[PDB]
């Protein structure tokens, strides 16, 4: 029987398909429960759950969760879960841009370059990929160029 976790915030690491699990940093006020990021993984780790559809995933997720915290947790499981796959999202078409070796020096300077009256911004135009800071950072930069741009 898995020991009481007794942990506040943070998260744990594992080699089971769930990989990383995070616990709520603060509890929603006025509530007795909470939602845990049972499974969160990138690349191939993620490529896995991508095989299964939204609805199926919850099963394993709970099992792999029990493998680390104990079968016992199953009692509090409300039976409600949510899953977000970014490769399957026709609007994100992926989590974020992440260069493979050499790509940056191969064409990143061309990524930022505007094309005629067309300007580019967003997470990927920066060099702080998979971060909002990159997004914002390039958003501003974009507005600066078009703002003072010769009409």
């Amino acid at each position: 029987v898995r020991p009481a976790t007794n942990a506040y915030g943070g998260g744990s690491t594992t080699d089971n398909p769930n990989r990383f699990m995070y616990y709520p940093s603060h509890p929603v006020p006025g509530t007795q429960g909470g939602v845990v990021l049972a499974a969160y993984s990138w690349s191939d780790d993620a490529a896995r759950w991508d095989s299964f559809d939204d609805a199926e995933r919850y099963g394993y997720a709970l099992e792999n969760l029990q493998s680390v915290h104990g079968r016992r947790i199953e009692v509090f499981y409300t039976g409600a879960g949510q899953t977000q796959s970014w490769l399957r999202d026709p609007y994100a078409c992926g989590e974020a841009a992440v260069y493979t070796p050499h790509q940056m020096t191969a064409f990143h300077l061309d990524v930022v370059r505007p094309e005629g009256p067309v300007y580019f911004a967003g997470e990927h135009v920066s060099l702080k990929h998979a971060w909002i800071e990159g997004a914002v950072e390039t958003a501003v930069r974009a507005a600066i160029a078009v703002n003072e741009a010769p009409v």
Partner: protein, 90 residues
């Protein structure tokens, strides 16, 4: 409306290149800009979220037997007998 056209003097494209890959463009952006759009790799990631009646992860061992036996008579020991499966997907 089947379609809808917009116009201006300047444009800021903020969609990810993975999505821009399917937009028809003209004239062609600069050769390198195209390659970057064809070649920029977008990593995949999936999050799975489960809801719990209580914040068990906060629990101590006492909290567990306490909280657990509250739901139903001798539910704590019921799981102690059961134990933990030895099969992992690791």
């Amino acid at each position: 409306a089947a379609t809808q056209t917009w116009t201006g003097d300047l444009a800021i494209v903020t969609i990810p290149f993975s999505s821009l890959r399917f937009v028809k463009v003209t004239p062609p952006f600069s050769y390198k800009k195209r390659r970057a759009v064809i070649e920029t790799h977008y990593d995949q990631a999936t999050k799975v979220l489960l809801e719990f009646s209580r914040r068990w992860w906060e629990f101590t061992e006492a909290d567990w037997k306490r909280e657990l036996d509250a739901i139903a008579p001798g539910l704590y020991d019921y799981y102690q007998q059961w134990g933990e499966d030895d099969a992992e997907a690791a």
